Design a binder for this molecule. Structure first.
Ligand SMILES: CC(=O)Nc1ccccc1O
Ligand code: NI
Length: 341
C-alpha cells in the first residue's frame, strides 16, 4: 500500500509511487527522476499517465520501454495545468532530468516536493521567490550536522589534477571511473576533457547517456574502448580483482590503472580534507574514493529551509525509525526558532 508521504492531499496525484500497484484515486503519477528506488515498479506494461521532465521521459521510453502514449513530458520553469491543477517543474540540482514540483492546490494551499535535490542559493531566485509555501516534502538524506562534504567544483578540481598528473608522468596509465546509475557524469567528462580523450563504455551505458540532452555528447563518448584512455565500468568492478581483470583485456596497451569511485558521504569526511585524500594501492593499481554528492549537505539544507519558511515539513528520507524521525523534528524546530518563527 502507498504511504501517506507519497500522496498530495486535495489532488489525485502521487509522487514516486510506482511499486504499490493501482493506487486508489490516483489520476496522474509524477516521477521526479530516473533513480531505481523512485521508479521501482515501472515497466513496459504500465497504463496510467506519467508526468516528468523531457530527460526522464527519454529514459522511460528507451530504457524501461514504457509506451509513448503514457509519457507526459513538461518543460521547466513553466506554469502547466494537469487534470485541472496548476503545476511547475523546477531543476533539482540532482542527476540529469531531476525535478522539484510546485503544486498550486484548488483551496489556495501551495506545496513544494523537492524530490531528491542538492539545495543551492540559486534556488532563492527561481519561481520560488514569489509566493508562500505551506507544505514542504523534503529530501532529508543528510539531515544531521556530521554530514559535511566539499563543493562539486572542489571535488572535480581534485579529480582533474590527480588524473592529469598521473598520465603526464606515465602516458601508459589508464583511467577508470565507476558508475551504477545516472548522475555524477561531470567526474568522467571532466577527466576525459583534460586528457584529450573520449570516454569509452558499454553499449548499455552509451544508450543511457544518449538520453540525457548533454550538449555535443557525440564528441565526448564512444563504444570503441581501444580509442579511449578513460573507461567506465560498473561500480561493482572497482576493486583490485576487477581492475586486474580489466587491464588484461586491454592487450598490453597499458601498464597502470588509476581508478575513481564516486561515493556519497563516508566517515572519512569527518577526519580528512579533500586536498589530503589518498588512494588504496596494490602494485600498479590505485583507487580513489571521492565525495561527490548530489544531495544537500546539512548546512545547504538548513539555509534553504530557513529561506523558504514553510509552515509544515514532511521528510521523504530516513522515515523508517523513531530515532531518525525525532532527530529530524528537533532540527526543524531549532531552525524555525532560530530564524525568529
Ligand atoms: C520547522 C518548520 O515547520 N518550518 C520553518 C519555518 C521557518 C524557518 C525554519 C523552519 O524549519
Ligand atoms: Ni536520487
Amino acid at each position: 500500500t502507498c504511504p501517506f508521504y507519497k500522496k498530495i492531499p486535495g489532488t489525485g496525484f502521487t509522487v514516486d509511487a510506482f511499486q504499490y500497484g493501482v493506487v486508489e484515486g490516483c489520476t496522474a503519477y509524477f516521477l521526479t527522476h530516473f533513480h531505481s528506488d523512485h521508479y521501482a515498479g515501472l515497466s513496459k506494461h504500465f497504463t496510467f499517465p506519467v508526468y516528468c521532465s523531457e530527460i526522464t521521459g527519454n529514459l522511460l521510453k528507451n530504457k524501461l520501454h514504457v509506451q509513448e502514449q503514457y509519457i507526459h513530458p513538461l518543460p521547466l520553469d513553466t506554469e502547466c495545468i494537469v487534470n485541472g491543477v496548476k503545476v511547475v517543474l523546477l531543476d533539482a540540482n540532482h542527476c540529469p532530468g531531476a525535478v522539484m514540483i510546485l503544486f498550486y492546490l484548488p483551496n489556495g494551499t501551495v506545496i513544494l516536493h523537492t524530490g531528491d535535490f542538492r539545495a543551492d542559493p540559486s534556488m532563492e531566485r527561481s519561481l520560488l521567490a514569489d509566493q508562500k509555501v505551506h507544505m514542504l516534502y523534503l529530501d532529508t538524506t543528510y539531515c544531521s550536522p556530521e554530514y559535511t562534504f566539499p563543493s562539486q567544483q572542489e571535488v572535480i578540481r581534485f579529480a582533474i589534477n590527480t588524473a592529469f598528473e598521473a598520465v603526464t608522468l606515465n602516458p601508459h596509465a589508464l583511467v577508470v571511473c565507476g558508475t551504477y546509475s545516472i548522475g555524477k557524469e561531470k567526474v568522467f567528462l571532466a577527466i576525459a576533457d583534460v586528457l584529450g580523450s573520449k570516454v569509452g563504455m558499454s553499449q548499455e551505458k552509451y544508450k543511457t547517456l544518449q538520453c540525457l540532452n548533454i550538449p555535443e555528447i557525440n564528441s565526448l563518448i564512444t563504444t570503441d574502448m581501444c580509442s579511449s584512455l578513460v573507461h567506465l565500468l560498473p561500480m561493482m568492478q572497482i576493486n583490485f580483482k576487477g581492475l586486474q581483470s580489466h587491464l588484461k583485456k586491454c592487450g598490453g596497451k597499458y601498464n597502470q590503472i588509476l581508478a575513481f569511485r564516486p561515493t556519497g558521504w563516508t566517515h572519512s569526511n569527518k577526519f580528512t580534507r579533500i586536498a589530503d585524500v589518498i588512494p588504496q594501492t596494490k602494485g600498479n593499481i590505485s583507487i580513489y574514493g571521492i565525495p561527490y554528492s548530489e544531495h544537500s549537505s546539512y548546512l545547504e539544507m538548513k539555509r534553504f529551509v530557513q529561506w523558504l519558511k514553510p509552515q509544515k515539513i514532511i521528510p521523504t528520507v530516513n522515515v523508517g525509525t523513531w530515532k531518525s524521525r525525532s532527530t529530524m523534528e528537533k532540527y526543524f524546530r531549532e531552525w524555525k526558532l532560530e530564524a525568529g518563527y
